[PDB]
Every structure is written in C-alpha cells, then in structure tokens.
Amino acid sequence: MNIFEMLRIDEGLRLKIYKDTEGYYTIGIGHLLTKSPSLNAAKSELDKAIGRNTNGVITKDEAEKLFNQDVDAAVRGILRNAKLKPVYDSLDAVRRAAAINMVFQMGETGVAGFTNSLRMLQQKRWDEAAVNLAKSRWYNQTPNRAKRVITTFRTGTWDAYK
Ligand SMILES: [Cl-]
Numbered sequence: 001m002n003i004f005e006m007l008r009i010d011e012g013l014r015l016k017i018y019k020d021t022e023g024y025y026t027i028g029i030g031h032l033l034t035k036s037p038s039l040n041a042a043k044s045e046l047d048k049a050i051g052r053n054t055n056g057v058i059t060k061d062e063a064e065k066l067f068n069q070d071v072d073a074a075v076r077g078i079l080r081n082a083k084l085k086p087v088y089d090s091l092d093a094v095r096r097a098a099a100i101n102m103v104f105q106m107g108e109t110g111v112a113g114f115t116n117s118l119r120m121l122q123q124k125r126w127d128e129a130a131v132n133l134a135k136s137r138w139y140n141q142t143p144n145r146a147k148r149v150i151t152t153f154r155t156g157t158w159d160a161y162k
C-alpha cells in the first residue's frame with residue numbers, strides 16, 4: 001500500500017464532472033475544479049487543467065495525470081509550510097501518507113489550523129492525537145474516511161485500508 005493506492009480508495013475515480021461531499025465541482029481522483037456554483041466555471045477550469053476542449057469528460061490517463069500532479073503539489077505544500085514541515089519530518093513513512101491524505105483533502109491552510117493535534121503527533125502521543133483529531137468538522141462530515149486516516153495515525157500501519 002502507498003499514498004496513491006490510499007487516496008485512490010478514499011476519493012474514487014470519476015470521469016465526468018461531479019459534485020464532491022461539500023457540493024463542489026470535481027473530476028477524476030478528487031481533483032477540485034472550483035468552489036463556484038457554475039457548471040460553466042467548472043467546465044472552463046477543466047479545459048484549462050487538461051489543455052483541451054473536454055466538454056466535461058476526461059480519460060483515465062488524464063485523470064491519473066491530474067492525480068500525479070495533485071499528490072506532488074500536496075507533498076510540496078507540506079514541505080514549504082513552516083508549521084507542517086517539522087511535524088511531517090518527525091513522522092515515519094506510513095504516518096507521512098496519512099498527513100499527505102489530510103492535506104490533499106483539506107488543503108494546507110485547513111490542516112495548519114489543527115495546531116493541537118499537530119503538536120501531539122510531533123510528540124508521538126498517538127492515542128491522544130487520535131482523540132483530538134476526531135473533535136473536528138472534518139470528522140463529523142466525512143466520518144468513515146476520517147476514521148481511516150486517524151487509525152493510520154494511531155497505529156502506524158495500513159490496517160484501515162486492508
Ligand atoms: Cl491544475
């Protein structure tokens with residue numbers, strides 16, 4: 001198991017524009033297109049992202065390409081962030097995948113606001129961090145996915161994904 005297979009399980013794959021859990025125009029493997037209500041603003045962003053007139057539909061390869069870019073960008077955002085970097089560096093390889101997952105889903109600002117959990121993770125207080133992470137809108141909105149990520153932080157194994 002690795003970050004790619006992990007996110008592929010959490011996000012699914014959709015080849016036609018769809019609305020995410022928050023109601024936003026998304027495509028592929030969790031690629032947010034726009035927070036605007038306009039399907040046209042979404043279609044525009046889509047064509048811009050792919051480099052072609054897509055009419056709202058992409059191929060698997062195109063999906064995977066967006067996905068490759070997004071994971072990369074997620075990692076780089078963590079590495080560039082003064083609050084996230086130290087925590088991330090402190091983690092083992094499995095837990096690092098959990099961190100990437102959160103950033104991919106909620107953005108760097110979002111995660112960055114989990115100050116207390118971040119401190120707990122850095123100190124390696126696993127059960128404590130797990131409890132604190134659950135006290136969040138994130139957990140309340142996407143409980144099954146949150147639980148999976150949280151279990152990964154708690155255990156340091158891929159059990160939630162097996
Ligand atoms: Cl893009």
Ligand SMILES: [Cl-]
Pocket residue numbers: 141142143144145146
């Ligand atoms: Cl969920």
